[PDB]
Ligand binder design. Structure first.
Ligand SMILES: CCCCCCCCCCCCCCCCCC(=O)OC[C@H](COP(=O)([O-])OC[C@H](O)COP(=O)([O-])OC[C@H](COC(=O)CCCCCCCCCCCCCCCCC)OC(=O)CCCCCCCCCCCCCCCCC)OC(=O)CCCCCCCCCCCCCCCCC
Ligand SMILES: CCCCCCCCCCCCCCCCCC(=O)OC[C@H](COP(=O)([O-])OC[C@H](O)COP(=O)([O-])OC[C@H](COC(=O)CCCCCCCCCCCCCCCCC)OC(=O)CCCCCCCCCCCCCCCCC)OC(=O)CCCCCCCCCCCCCCCCC
Ligand SMILES: CCCCCCCCCCCCCCCCCC(=O)OC[C@H](COP(=O)(O)OCCN)OC(=O)CCCCCCCCCCCCCCCCC
Lengths: 459, 171
């Protein structure tokens, strides 16, 4: 994986040796070249993962996450170069360096052959994220947003560390390729119970779990746009990725200890969608929608069936693209009206017709319109959870009601109705912003033609 | 533990040299010269055995030969010796230097009538060799078997197997 780590590292001289005005263009061009290079990870096989070295490998699970991760960086560079137009050149290079460093930590988080290197990169992704949120945020509450984001996560993960080191003393290796073949049944005891809780609660925090989700409506509305894109797009999927790596070790104790977490997620996807029905803040509405969607991935991992894992990985990739597009649309309003109030700028289809088309398409992919990979992941999770218990379709179907009722209401409040009279700085849509919308949406529509590359290790 | 083994009281009875300390110190150089051999056999047995219960017969030889010394003084030169140890016995620190004329009379009478030379300065402090027939004590400290030591380091130092093996570090 060293043909992706070295160009990402070499983006640091490419952003610190550039001209004082060329630094967005150079980093955009070379991050797009790395994103085009990211398709060489698709040498996958039906039995054996693409195993590079002792340090790095990539199956069909980490490969769509890597393609999405290396694709997100040019999109974050395009989104972040408007509010950083008056910024100091040194601080501008610092922001681009934090984006590059976070990309590096993510692309060698998903490719960790050994699980403590996964933990080190998985908790190394906090630091550039924390610096981005607390430094280039906008409001007063970004500082508290750096605390709840941090001290929830470590509260989940500093147990996990200990549990991982226990396996290092017990099995002798945290290699995932060894632990496929040395895995032992984890019986019913209190020691193994808290072993399970230590292995799972860190990723329960970063999904987020309902009840533990309280960091996320604070961390999305207080970050800049590149921070919100990297949280909703990638940094919520470290939890699902880590769960799919770590529940191999946790059997058969998953089949009786994961009951309350399934209950929490099946009720939290109802509760956070209900919260999305009453959010006065647009960016908060997208944050609570992200909690509502990741609850399905939590349920699909905790029932551990093949249809559930395929739906969960399709839903993770689809939600990454869709939530990144919705935060960029909220940014496109926020850069003109300078307020995140959803009721403030109304009737914007009269003023921005093509941007209202992009809002329409992003809201249709939020409500899982077929044949999008949103609907493919949603549908496969609903199939597997109907197989799990026949009653859960109620909690699925009711959710699929409310998931529409905030996807279009967010459309009807911001884009439809009579336009707000006392707002007149609604500029036409920039080519940067429309390019950003199309680079989010056009891969999300092209993956409908070929979904088999985003359906996990067990397609 | 075990019973301590003490000799009986009749094993410790011997004709003691029943004289005072100034009688001894006044005759001390001639006693160190003439009674050399059983005294050195005894002090050899006393430092080699490191047990007074294994040194009783040499102590009886010492207590016999000292009496033979004082008898051989008593047969010939009892009165110059008596006046000399009386002069030595007067002083509190028992100085030899206060009583050199009685020392000269005692040394002259001893040299004439017995043929004894007083040892000069330095001679009685010598370390002398002793010809005894008793064996060397093979275990004077009554020790036991020392524990076997740990096995040492040997063999050619090969490089480490697969590096450090610290969680993921391949070197
Ligand atoms: C490998 C090559 C593959 C090539 C094939 C393409 C594959 C899919 C790629 C993307 C396709 C959609 C792109 C258009 C929408 C986005 C842009 C936009 O706003 O357009 C309006 C604009 C036209 O409007 P305008 O008057 O000029 O100005 C804007 C208007 O004022 C204001 O706008 P408006 O109000 O007029 O427009 C709103 C209107 C509103 O109408 C709708 O939203 C109705 C459509 C959705 C609901 C009903 C259909 C549900 C699904 C059934 C159909 C699919 C399956 C059918 C097959 C049989 C059954 C299985 O939307 C449309 O008219 C868009 C029609 C297409 C919608 C596709 C579905 C998106 C819905 C959400 C996801 C649904 C599931 C996934 C679907 C995946 C399909 C492959 O379009 C353009 O100018 C087009 C520009 C070029 C677009 C290129 C797209 C492909 C790029 C890929 C590049 C790489 C590969 C190379 C191939 C290149 C091919 C050319
Ligand atoms: C004819 C006689 C002469 C022949 C000459 C032949 C050589 C000519 C060229 C000589 C120059 C050296 C070139 C590199 C040699 C290969 C080293 C390598 O790539 O190891 C891959 C190494 C393991 O991969 P592999 O596939 O198992 O083995 C491939 C080789 O065969 C690895 O082979 P190995 O098994 O022998 O490797 C031993 C072991 C293999 O590694 C392991 O066992 C894995 C554990 C390593 C430590 C992981 C720590 C994780 C937690 C901390 C992370 C910190 C943040 C990450 C960096 C953020 C930015 C600072 O590595 C270590 O123990 C060393 C620690 C890592 C240092 C690597 C060398 C860097 C030199 C240049 C420094 C520039 C800054 C680099 C970034 C700073 C941090 C490294 O990859 C990593 O550990 C991931 C990080 C990437 C490595 C460093 C990339 C170097 C090139 C950067 C260019 C761009 C720089 C831009 C500015 C600086 C950044 C802001
Ligand atoms: C909402 C806030 C955010 C989220 C926070 C985390 C929520 C999830 C964790 C709490 C959920 C409720 C507790 C879990 C219930 C299901 C599993 C379980 O422990 O069952 C209860 C257990 C049943 O007993 P038994 O099956 O015999 O287990 C013996 C094991 N050898 O019953 C007993 O053994 C009796 C009770 C023992 C003490 C329970 C409390 C301490 C241990 C759990 C922590």
């Amino acid at each position: 994986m060293l043909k992706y780590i070295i160009p990402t590292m070499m983006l640091m001289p490419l952003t610190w040796l550039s001209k004082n005005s060329m630094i967005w263009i150079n980093t955009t061009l070379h991050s797009l070249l790395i994103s085009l290079t990211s398709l060489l990870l698709l040498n996958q096989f039906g039995d054996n993962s693409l195993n590079f070295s002792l340090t790095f490998f990539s199956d069909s699970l980490s490969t769509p996450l890597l393609i999405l991760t290396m694709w997100l960086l040019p999109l974050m560079l395009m989104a972040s170069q408007h509010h950083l137009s008056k910024e100091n050149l040194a601080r501008k290079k610092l922001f681009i360096s934090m984006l590059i460093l976070l990309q590096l930590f993510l692309i060698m988080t998903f490719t960790a052959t050994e699980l403590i290197f996964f933990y080190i990169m998985f908790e190394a992704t906090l630091v550039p994220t924390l610096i981005i949120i607390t430094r280039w945020g906008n409001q007063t509450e970004r500082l508290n947003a750096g605390l709840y984001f941090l001290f929830y996560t470590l509260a989940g993960s500093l147990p996990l560390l200990v549990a991982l080191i226990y396996i290092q003393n017990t099995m002798g290796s945290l290699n995932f390729l060894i632990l496929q073949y040395w895995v032992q049944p984890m019986p019913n005891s209190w020691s193994n119970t808290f072993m399970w809780l230590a292995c799972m609660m860190a990723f329960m925090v970063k999904m987020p779990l309902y009840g533990l989700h309280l960091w996320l409506p604070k961390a999305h509305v207080e970050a800049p746009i590149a921070g919100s894109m990297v949280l909703a797009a990638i940094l919520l999927k470290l939890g699902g990725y880590g769960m799919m790596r770590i529940t191999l070790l946790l059997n058969p104790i998953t089949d009786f200890m994961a009951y309350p977490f399934i209950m929490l997620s099946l009720w939290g996807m109802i509760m956070t969608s209900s919260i999305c029905l009453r959010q006065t803040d647009l960016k908060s509405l997208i944050a609570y929608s992200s909690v509502s969607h990741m609850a399905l991935v939590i349920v699909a991992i905790l029932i551990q069936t093949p249809w559930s894992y395929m739906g969960a990985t399709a839903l993770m990739i689809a939600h990454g693209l869709t939530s990144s597009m919705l935060f960029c649309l909220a940014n496109s309003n926020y850069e003109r009206v300078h307020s995140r109030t959803m009721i403030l700028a109304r009737g914007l289809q009269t003023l921005l017709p093509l941007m209202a088309a992009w809002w329409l398409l992003a809201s249709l992919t939020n409500l899982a319109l077929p044949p999008s990979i949103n609907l493919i992941g949603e549908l496969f999770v609903v199939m597997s959870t109907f197989s799990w218990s026949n009653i859960t379709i109620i909690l699925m179907g009711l959710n699929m009601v409310i998931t529409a009722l905030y996807s279009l209401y967010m459309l009807i409040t911001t884009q439809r109705g009579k336009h707000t009279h006392h707002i007149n700085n609604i500029l036409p849509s920039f080519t940067r912003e429309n390019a950003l919308m199309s680079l989010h949406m056009l891969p999300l529509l092209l993956l409908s033609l070929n979904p088999k590359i985003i359906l996990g290790p067990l397609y | 533990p075990g019973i301590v083994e003490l000799p009986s009281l009749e094993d410790l009875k011997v004709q003691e040299v029943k004289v005072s300390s100034s009688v001894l110190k006044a005759a001390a150089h001639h006693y160190g010269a003439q009674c050399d051999k059983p005294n050195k056999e005894f002090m050899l047995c006393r430092w080699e055995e490191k047990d007074p219960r294994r040194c009783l017969e040499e102590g009886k030889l010492v207590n016999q030969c000292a009496l033979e010394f004082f008898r051989q003084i008593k047969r010939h030169c009892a009165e110059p010796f008596t006046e000399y140890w009386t002069c030595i016995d007067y002083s509190g620190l028992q100085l030899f230097r206060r009583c050199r004329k009685e020392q000269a009379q005692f040394d002259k009478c001893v040299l004439d009538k017995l043929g004894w030379v007083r040892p000069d300065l330095g001679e009685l402090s010598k370390v002398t060799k002793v010809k005894t027939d008793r064996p060397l004590p093979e275990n004077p400290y009554h020790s036991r078997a020392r524990p076997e030591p740990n096995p040492e380091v040997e063999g050619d130092l090969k490089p480490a197997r697969h590096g450090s093996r610290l969680f993921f570090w391949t070197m």
